[PDB]
Design a protein around this ligand. Structure first.
Ligand SMILES: Nc1ncnc2c1ncn2[C@@H]1O[C@H](COP(=O)(O)OP(=O)(O)O)[C@@H](O)[C@H]1O
Ligand SMILES: Nc1ncnc2c1ncn2[C@@H]1O[C@H](COP(=O)(O)OP(=O)(O)O)[C@@H](O)[C@H]1O
Ligand SMILES: Nc1ncnc2c1ncn2[C@@H]1O[C@H](COP(=O)(O)OP(=O)(O)O)[C@@H](O)[C@H]1O
Ligand SMILES: Nc1ncnc2c1ncn2[C@@H]1O[C@H](COP(=O)(O)OP(=O)(O)O)[C@@H](O)[C@H]1O
Lengths: 247, 247, 247, 247
C-alpha cells in the first residue's frame, strides 16, 4: 500500500468538494477526485491540476453515487492505485429551488431525486469505502468520514423541502454510522449556511449576525480539521452558518 | 359543514393510529379511519366499531399514502362527508428490521421503500389536507397536524438505518411545515421509544430508566393533547421514550 | 394519608403557578399553594379562593425557596396535612430586565440573585419533596416534577443574560434529576415563550409565527398533561413558544 | 500595539488551559498565561517556560476570575504589554465530586461556589476583554472567545449536579454572548468528555465508543481551530467526547 494517506472526495468537481480536494492536497495527502459525469469533467480536471500543483498525487474517478455499482467501482479504482483510504468526504449532492410554501410545485419524483444523491448515494459511497477505511485505521488513530449536510437539515429551511428532508436524514444517518463504525472510523457531518461558490451577496450578508457569507475553502478547513486533528469527535453535526441559528 | 370537529388518521388499522382514532372518538370528534389495504381492513373495521361504541361518527377510507392520488381521494371522501378537517394524525409507516452494522443486508430499494411511506407519503397526506385544515381554523384557534416519528429519528437507532434516516427527515419536514403553515395550522412530531402493540417485554423494560414500555394509548393521549390543548406548540418533536435518551 | 392526590406549586401567587394551582384544583387534586411573602399573600389568597371554588382542598404555605429551611418546612406542612405529594410544579422564579448588550449594567450580585431562586431554590424544593414523591409513586404509576424554565434557557434570549443562564442550568438540572429519580419520579421542564399575565401585546404577537401570545392557563395545561397523562415522558424540555424557535 | 496576535488563557496553570497556551505559543501567538493563586504558580511558570521554548512572548497574570476586579486588572496588564487581545480562552473552572443521587451531600454553598468560577467568572473575564477583542477585530476577520464547558452541561452527568448545572448555564451564556457580540467577536463553547491530565483509565476507555480518552492537547487543538480557521462558526457547543453521546 501507499505510504501517503488517501482522501476520497465525491462532488469534487466544484464547490465544497473541489475546495476540500485542494485542502487535502495542500496537506500532502493523495486525493481521489470524484467527478460526476461528462458535464463536470472539465471542472474536475482543473481541480486535479490545482491539487497536483499543490504537490499531491491524484486520480479522477467518475461516479453517480446514486448507483451502488458506481460507488464500488470508484473504491476499486482507489484500492488498485494506493490500497488505502484514510478519509472519505461525501460532497456529492443535488437540489432544485422550490419555495417551501409552493406545495403544488414539488412532487414525489423530486423528493426521490434529491434523496437518491444526498442520502442513498452518501450511504452507498460510505459503505463501499468502509472495508478500506477500517483497514487503514491504526492501533492509535481512527479514519474519518465527513458528510456535507446543510443548515437546512437542522431547521427545515433551504432550497426546497425535499432538500431539507434529505439533509435531516443525512444528520440521523451520520449518528447510526458513527455508532456502528466506532472505534475504527469516526463519522461527522457539516452543516454550512450560505456559501458563495463565486445583490444576492449583499442580501445573504446582511441577514447573518456575522455579516458575511462562507467561501468553500472554510468548509474544506473544517473537513480537514475533523479528519486530522479531532480523534475524540464522532457523531456530531457541526454548524458553520455565520450565526444564522442565532436569529 | 359538520358542526362536530373531524380528525383524519392514517395508519389507523392498528397500533398508534388505531389508539389515536379511539382517543379522538372518546373526545366526541368524528374520525376518518385510514385503512391501508385488504390485508388491514378487518382490523380497521374493528377500530371503527370501537370508535362508534365510543360515540363517534366514522368513515373508513383506503389509501396507500405513497400514492399522491390516494391521499387526494381520501381527503375528497372526508370533504364530501363532513366538509372540514380539524386534525390530521400521520401514523402510516413501514419498516423492516435490519441490523445497522449489516451493511451488506440493506439496499437502495429498502431506503426508498421506507422513505416512500414514512416521508413522501406523510408529506402527500399533509399537503392534500392543507386546504381544509386552513379553512377549518378559526379566528382564535389553529388546526393541528401530528406526525408520528420515532426515537430512531433523533439518535439513529431503531429497526434499520433506512428507518432511522426516514424519521430524521420527518423531524426536519415537520419544521418546514410548521414554519410555512403558521399561523393557521400547527405541525408537530412525536418520537416514541419502545411501544408494545400487544422476554422481549422484559428486555425493553429493563433498559429503560422508567422501567416500562409504552402502550399505544399513551401516544394517542399525546396526539390528542397537542391538538386540543396546545395552541402555542408548533415545530416541536416530543420524545416519549421512557427515559432512553438519558442513557 | 389522604385518598386524594396532592400537587405542590411554588410561585403559586400569580402567573403560571396561579394558573397551575387552579388547573390541578379543577382536576380534583388537593393543592398546596406556595406563597412567597407578605407582598404576594393577597394574590395567593385569591388563588386559594378560586381553587376552593373549583372544589379542591387547599393549604397556603410561605416559602422563600432560596432558603433550604423554607423548602423543608413547606414540605413538612404538606406532609402533616395530607401525608402525600403526587406532583411538584416549580414556578417560583425571578428576573430583572437588563439588555444583554449592556455589559456595564449587570453584575455578579444579579447573577447570584437570579440563580438563587431559579436554580438553587428549584433544586432545594425538589430535594425536599423527593421522599414523599417517591413514597407516593405506585407499582404502576410514577409521580411528577415539572420545572418552569424558559425559551431563554434554550436560545440565550430573554429578560437578562443572568436569567437566560439560570434557565440553561434549569434545563440541565432537569436531566440529572430525571436520570437519578427514575423510575419512581419523572422530571420535565417547560420552556414558555411570551406569556401575558394580564402595543406591547401587538409587538409580541406579530413577531411570533403563530401570531399570538400565551396565557398562563396554557402552561398550566401542559404541566397537568405531563403529570397525569405522560407516563413515558421524563428528562424533556417542552417548548411552548408560539413558533419563535422557527424564526 | 503589538504586531503579533495575543491569546489570553484563564485556567492556564494546568490541564486544558495549559495545553491551550502551548498550542497558541506553537502558532507564534503571544500568550497571557492566567494563573490562579500561589498554589498553582509553579505549574504556571512551567507552562510559561514551555511556551517561551515554543517561541512565544509571554506574561503571567494572577486572577481569581470570580472577582470582577481581578478580571479587569488582568486585562489591564495585557493591554499595557501588547495593546491587543485576539482570543480569550476561558478555561478557569472548579468542581467537587458529589454523586448526583446523594441529595443530602450537596448544598447551596457548593452550587454557588461552582457557579462563581464556571459561569460568573467566565462572564466577568469575557466582559473585561470585550473592548480590546472588538478593537482587535479587522475589516475582514473577527476575534474569538472559546468557553470550556463540558459534556456534563449537555446531558446532566459529570462530577456533580452543581457542576452540570453551571455548564448548562455556560452553554446558554455562550449563545447570548455570540448573538450580542456579533459580528466583531465569535463566541463558542467546547464540551469535552473524559480528559486524562496525566483502572480509572481502563474504565473510561471501555465505556466510550471510540475506546479512548482525550488528552488536553486535543481540546487545545479545537480551541485553536475555532479561533484561527472558523470565521463562520459562532454560538456553537462542540462536543469532543469520544462518542459517549451515542450511548
Ligand atoms: N448523482 C451524483 N453523483 C455524483 N456526484 C453528483 C451527483 N449529483 C450531483 N453531483 C455533484 O455533486 C456536486 C455538488 O456540489 P456543488 O453543486 O458545486 O455545490 P456545494 O459545493 O455547495 O455542494 C457537483 O459536483 C455535482 O456535479
Ligand atoms: N403505504 C402505506 N399507506 C398507508 N398505510 C400504510 C402504508 N404502509 C403501511 N401502512 C399502515 O401503517 C400502519 C403502521 O402502524 P403499526 O405498523 O401497526 O405500528 P405503530 O402503531 O408503532 O406505527 C399499519 O396500519 C400499516 O398497515
Ligand atoms: N425567592 C422566592 N421564593 C419563592 N417564590 C418566589 C421567590 N421569588 C419570587 N417568587 C415568586 O415566584 C412567582 C414568579 O411568577 P410570576 O413573577 O407571576 O411570572 P410567571 O407566571 O411568568 O412565572 C411570583 O409569585 C413570585 O412572587
Ligand atoms: N476562581 C478561579 N479563578 C481562576 N482560576 C481558577 C479558579 N478556580 C480554579 N481555577 C483554575 O482553573 C483550572 C482548572 O483546570 P484543571 O482543574 O487543571 O482541569 P481541566 O484542564 O479539565 O479544566 C486550574 O488551573 C485552577 O487552578
Amino acid at each position: 500500500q501507499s505510504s501517503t494517506p488517501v482522501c476520497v472526495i465525491t462532488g469534487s468537481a466544484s464547490g465544497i468538494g473541489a475546495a476540500t480536494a485542494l485542502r487535502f492536497a495542500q496537506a500532502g495527502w493523495s486525493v481521489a477526485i470524484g467527478n460526476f459525469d461528462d458535464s463536470t469533467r472539465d471542472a474536475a480536471s482543473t481541480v486535479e491540476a490545482l491539487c497536483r500543483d499543490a504537490g499531491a498525487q491524484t486520480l479522477i474517478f467518475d461516479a453517480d453515487v446514486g448507483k451502488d455499482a458506481d460507488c464500488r467501482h470508484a473504491v476499486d479504482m482507489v484500492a488498485s492505485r494506493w490500497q488505502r483510504i484514510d478519509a472519505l468526504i461525501n460532497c456529492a449532492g443535488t437540489t432544485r429551488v422550490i419555495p417551501h410554501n409552493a406545495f403544488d410545485q414539488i412532487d414525489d419524483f423530486e423528493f426521490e431525486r434529491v434523496y437518491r444523491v444526498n442520502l442513498i448515494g452518501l450511504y452507498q459511497m460510505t459503505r463501499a469505502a468502509v472495508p478500506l477505511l477500517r483497514e487503514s485505521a491504526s492501533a492509535t488513530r481512527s479514519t474519518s468520514v465527513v458528510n456535507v449536510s446543510s443548515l437546512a437539515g437542522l431547521n427545515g429551511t433551504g432550497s426546497s423541502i425535499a432538500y431539507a428532508a434529505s439533509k435531516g436524514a443525512v444528520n440521523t444517518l451520520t449518528l447510526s454510522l458513527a455508532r456502528n463504525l466506532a472505534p475504527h472510523i469516526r463519522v461527522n457531518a457539516l452543516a454550512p449556511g450560505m456559501v458563495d461558490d463565486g445583490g444576492v451577496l449583499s442580501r445573504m450578508t446582511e441577514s447573518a449576525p456575522l455579516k458575511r457569507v462562507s467561501r468553500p475553502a472554510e468548509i474544506a478547513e473544517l473537513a480537514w480539521f475533523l479528519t486530522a486533528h479531532a480523534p475524540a469527535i464522532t457523531g456530531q453535526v457541526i454548524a458553520a452558518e455565520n450565526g444564522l441559528l442565532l436569529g
